[PDB]
Every structure is written in C-alpha cells, then in structure tokens.
Amino acid sequence: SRSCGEVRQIYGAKGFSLSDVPQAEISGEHLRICPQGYTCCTSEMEENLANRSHAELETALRDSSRVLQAMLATQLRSFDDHFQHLLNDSERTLQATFPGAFGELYTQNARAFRDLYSELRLYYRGANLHLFWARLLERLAPRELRLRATRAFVAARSFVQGLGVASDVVRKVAQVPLGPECSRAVMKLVYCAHCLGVPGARPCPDYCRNVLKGCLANQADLDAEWRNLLDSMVLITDKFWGTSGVESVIGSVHTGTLEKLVSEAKAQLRDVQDFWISLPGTLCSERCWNGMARGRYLPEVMGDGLANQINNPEVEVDITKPDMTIRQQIMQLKIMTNRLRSAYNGN
C-alpha cells in the first residue's frame, strides 16, 4: 500500500530523472492537471508526463496521416501514369503501324498530329480548357471526337486532381496542433492513473473516446465533405467503361489494367471513408480508470464533430471557434466534389 515503487519503475523507463520521485505518497494539492489527492507524482513529474502524453498522441496522429497520405499518393501516381501511358501509347500505336497504311497524307501531317496529341496532353494536365481542323482543312464525325474526348479526359483529370485534393487536405489538416485543454485532458486520461496510485490500470474505452473526440472534433467536421468527395470519386469511375467509356475514348482518338486499378482504388477508398471519425475508436482499441479512480465510466460517448462537443465532460470545447484551416480544406473538398459531379453529369 502507498507504493511509489512501481511508479518509480515506470517513470524511469521514460528516460526521466529517478531523483525526482518520492519514496512515499505526498500531498497532491499542488497538482495542476490530475485531480487533487495523495500522489507519487510531483509537479515536474506531472509536467513531464503531460509532455510525454502529448508527444504520444501527436506521434500517433502523425503516423496515421503519413499512412493515409502515402496510400493516396501511390493511387494518384498510379492512375496519372496509367492515363499518360494510355495516350502516349495511342500515339505510339499511331507511329508504328500508320506510315504506309494512311499513305503519304500521314507522312506530311505527322508533325501536326504530334502537335494534336501534345495539345491533348495539355488538356489532360488542365493547362488549357479551351478547345486543328481549320489548319488541316486549309492545308488539305469530328464533333463526336470533340464530345467523347472531352467526356473522358475531364473525368480522368477530375479523378487524378481529386486524389491530389484529398492528399492536400490530409497533409494540411495534419499540421493543426492540439489545444492546451486537450493536452491536459490527455494527461488526465493516460498518466494520471500512475500518479493517483493505480499505474497498472487501463483507462475506460468511453472515457478515452470522449477525450479523443473532444480533441479531434474539428478534424471530425471534415467527415461529410470527405465522404462526399470519396463518393463522387467512386462515381466518376463508372464513366470509364463501355464503348463510350473513358479508357476506350482515350485509346480511340486516332480512329484490363485500369479495371484492376479501379477495383483496388475502390477498396482503399471504402477503407478510408471512415477516417476522420475513426481515430478515437482506433487509438482506444490499441475495472477501468475513469480519471477519478478505478471504476465504471458514467457518461455516454459524445457524438462526432465540433458542435457535439459543447457538453463534452472530459474536454471543454469552444464551438464558436472553428479551426480556420479545417474549414478551408472543407471548402476545397466541396469545390473538388462539385467539379467531379459536373464532370460526371455532362458539363
């Protein structure tokens, strides 16, 4: 009973000084974060534990963000390269087989055709959205190419650009720092059990979830527009198939790999659609500590988002102060989603 021994054992494996830990429990009136009671932790010990917990949560969030961003980058590069190869090899197919087939009409105008495909590459890159036949006719059905090429290219470009926007939102949101009250609540969640005499106690799941939802609420606001974006990006792949399909059009300009990539992308995107609300449940998964002491955790789990954190017991959140960067990224999501929807619905 009244053991500072085990707390001393744990506190030293964090790298912290073993001189600062008392032999027995002292008066805990001086504790800023932890609820005041008899404790084995001093002020500096408590602060060090706070720093440690904050760094832990930060590290976890960073790692998760790195994983998501890596997946998105891989997908983006993959699809972009596949489309570029599709067009480049359409042009290559035009180079190898054509020269004697179309006669010498092709031989003289070959440079003009190369210029055409180059311009199409410019259209795929979104460099110029304005859309040769005059130059041809002067130097001497196309409207179907005019419609189809647009329909396909805007879809592919919107998909790639969409992945880019997702990656951008993840990356820029990842830079948002945690609040001081969040740090305090996290310290109260994790290492306050050690100070209060129950170092071997595991925190309650609902308690952890309320803390993490309190901290991450702003990030949780991204849910609706993130899901909308991913949904539209799933939908834009429906245009890829058929005689009027995207790949067939991109390949038919002069007149399966993409399928597997689309399936994989579908799986990976369905996996990450829960991302913004998933983090609290994920971290809490990998006779409990309710922050007062060992026992049951009374309060129910809060809903997701900033507004639902107004009554959050473990974290005091100001819902009239939305993070600006988050809302900016929300707008980015809504805009890209609108562009995808427009690209899908025919203009």
Ligand X SMILES: *[C@@H]1O[C@H](CO)[C@@H](O)[C@H](O)[C@H]1NC(C)=O
Interface residue list for ligand X (CB under 6 A): 84, 88, 121
- Which residue is it, tokens 């805007």? 154
Residue type, 124: Y
141 burial type by CB count under 10 A (0-12 exposed, 13-18 middle, 19+ buried)? exposed
Nearest approach in angstroms of CB 224 to ligand X is: 37
Residue placing its CB nearer to ligand X in the complex, 84 or 273? 84
- Cβ-based nearer residue to ligand X, 95 or 328: 95
- Element at 294 (helix H, strand E): strand 294-295
User: Between 59 and 88, whose beta carbon lies closer to ligand X?
Assistant: 88
Spatial CB neighbours of 252, under 8 Å, sequence gap ≥ 6: 148
- CB-based contact 254:94 (threshold 8 Å): yes
- Burial of residue 332, with CB atoms counted within 10 A of its CB: 0-12 exposed, 13-18 middle, 19 or more buried: middle
Query: Closest separation between CB of residue 164 and ligand X, Å?
Result: 17
Q: Which is nearer to ligand X, 84 or 228 (CB)?
A: 84
Phi, psi of 193 (to 5 degrees): -65, -40
How many C-beta atoms lie closer than 10 Å to residue 267's C-beta? Answer: 10
* Closest separation in Å from C-beta 81 to ligand X: 7
**CB 211 within 8 Å of CB 189:** yes
Which residue, 121 or 254, has its beta carbon nearer to ligand X? 121
Q: Toward ligand X, which CB reaches closer, 225 or 247? A: 247
Q: Which is nearer to ligand X, 117 or 241 (CB)?
A: 117
Which uninterrupted H or E stretch holds 209?
Answer: helix 205-220
Q: How far is the CB of 312 from ligand X (least distance, A)?
A: 50
Q: Minimum CB separation from ligand X for residue 121, in Å?
A: 6
- Minimum distance between the CB of residue 119 and ligand X, rounded to whole angstroms? 12
User: CB nearest ligand X: which residue?
Assistant: 88
What CA dihedral angle connects 314, 320, 321 and 322, to 10 degrees? 90
**Residue 117 Cβ vs ligand X, minimum distance, rounded to whole Å:** 8
For residue 118, the minimal CB distance to ligand X (Å) is 8
Which of 107, 118 has the CB closer to ligand X? 118
> Closer CB to ligand X, residue 88 or residue 328?
88
Minimum CB distance to ligand X, residue 85 (Å): 7
